């Protein structure tokens, strides 16, 4: 790793569990060069009951805005999935 001034850019992709699972499979399979890393599926944790609740989520990181732009051009977003893009500074 080269030391990284400023923030890394990433995205949050969501939908049903199986949607998200398949979406990942696709990007790893057909798009690996367009993203840095991806997470396994997670959920926003519920207080009561089963922790796994609401929409399935993955974070995908990118080495630069340009890589994220290239990702966005080529990677199909299935119907009912959503994507939002963010830029994160490291604080500590």
Interface positions with its own copies (CB under 8 A) = 7, 9-10, 24, 28, 32, 37-45, 47, 51-52, 57-59, 83-92
Q: Which is nearer to its own copies, 3 or 90 (CB)?
A: 90
Residue 52 and residue 16 in contact, taking contact as beta carbons nearer than 8 Å? no
User: End-to-end alpha-carbon separation of the chain, Å?
Assistant: 18
Dihedral sign for Cα 56, 15, 36, 64, please.
negative
Nearer to its own copies, 18 or 87 (CB): 87
In whole angstroms, the minimum distance from the beta carbon of 46 to its own copies comes to: 9
Q: Identify which of residues 29 and 79 has a Cβ nearer to its own copies in the complex.
A: 29
Q: How far is the CB of 82 from its own copies (least distance, A)?
A: 11
Nearest to 86 by CA among 3, 13, 2, 5: 13
């Amino acid at each position: 790793h080269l030391l990284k001034a400023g923030g890394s850019c990433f995205a949050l992709i969501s939908g049903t569990a199986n949607q998200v699972k398949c979406y990942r499979f696709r990007v790893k399979k057909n798009h690996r060069h367009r993203y840095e890393n991806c997470t396994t599926t997670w959920f926003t944790v519920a207080d009561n009951g089963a922790e796994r609740q609401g929409q399935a989520q993955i974070l995908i990181t990118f080495g630069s805005p340009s890589q994220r732009q290239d990702f966005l051009k080529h990677v199909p977003l299935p119907p009912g999935m959503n994507i939002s893009g963010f830029t994160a500074s490291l604080d500590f």
